[PDB]
């Protein structure tokens, strides 16, 4: 995350880390939606242009984390995947449409002061909260800057970062890029005239873009850190996978009222 700040301990208990076994490399973020289901962006798992194709037993899921690298022996919980699901109409080639994946946990996780699931929006919450103007909150252990001077410092954070940033109107998003924006995306960030910065950046993907409802005092995951042109460029906004339009699929595959 660019232009963010350190998160406090426990402030995003649904933040999950996508950890690759070998070599041990932080691969993306993710979110806890349940004691067994974790939602991520699909291109964490499946990006053919960079020869990126993970199978359930390549990766691990570390839930409860504060520090990027430390083994938080008493707080975090480290899980294996049973099945990975990628959205059948995920378009990595052309526009990154339906950048979503679920992953089911081989065994369910115990909830604590540091592990707890976010909500998934219903129609009225999507209706009333996804508005241009309203701020969301993005967190993640991804790159702090677009590029930096090699070996003069650390370009990825020591701890989970937070940035709050507002949702831009479709037309403005649409005329910020020449890439084919679909109704399964939103873009978010500040305008150049806005005089505030922030973005997500590489390795922040799959991390949740959340909002808090003032009326029930709860948090809803509205989006998934998906793609963008560079990071923290002026007149450039970050794009997220609009979770609410993809919720019927998430229904189909959680299949809750079943076997």
């Amino acid at each position: 995350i660019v232009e963010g700040s350190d998160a406090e301990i426990g402030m995003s208990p649904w933040q999950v880390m996508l950890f690759r076994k070998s070599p041990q490399e932080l691969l993306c973020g993710a979110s806890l939606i349940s004691d067994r289901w974790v939602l991520t962006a699909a291109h964490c798992l499946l990006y053919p242009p960079w020869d990126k194709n993970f199978t359930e037993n390549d990766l691990l899921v570390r839930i409860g984390k504060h520090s990027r690298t430390r083994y938080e022996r008493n707080i975090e919980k480290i899980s294996m995947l049973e099945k990975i699901y990628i959205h059948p109409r995920y378009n990595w080639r052309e526009n990154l449409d339906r950048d979503i994946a679920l992953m089911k946990l081989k065994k369910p996780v115990a909830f604590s002061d540091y592990i707890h699931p976010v909500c998934l929006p219903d129609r009225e919450t999507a209706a009333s909260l996804l508005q241009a103007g309203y701020k969301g909150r993005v967190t993640g252990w991804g790159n702090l800057k677009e590029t930096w001077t090699a070996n003069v410092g650390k370009g990825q954070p020591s701890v989970l970062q937070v940035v709050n940033l507002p949702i831009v109107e479709r037309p403005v998003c649409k005329d910020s890029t020449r890439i084919r924006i679909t109704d399964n995306m939103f873009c978010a960030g500040y305008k150049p005239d806005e005089g505030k910065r922030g973005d997500a950046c590489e390795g922040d993907s799959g991390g949740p873009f959340v909002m808090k409802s003032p009326f029930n005092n709860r948090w809803y995951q509205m989006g998934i850190v998906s793609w963008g042109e560079g990071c923290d460029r002026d007149g450039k906004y970050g794009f997220y996978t609009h979770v609410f339009r993809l919720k019927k699929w998430i229904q189909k595959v959680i299949d809750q009222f079943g076997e």
Binding site: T177, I179, A200, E202, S226, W227, G230
Partner: peptide, 10 residues
């Protein structure tokens, strides 16, 4: 073409 248009996955 995402890559062509200078797009980048995160």
């Amino acid at each position: 073409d995402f890559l062509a248009e200078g797009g980048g996955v995160r």
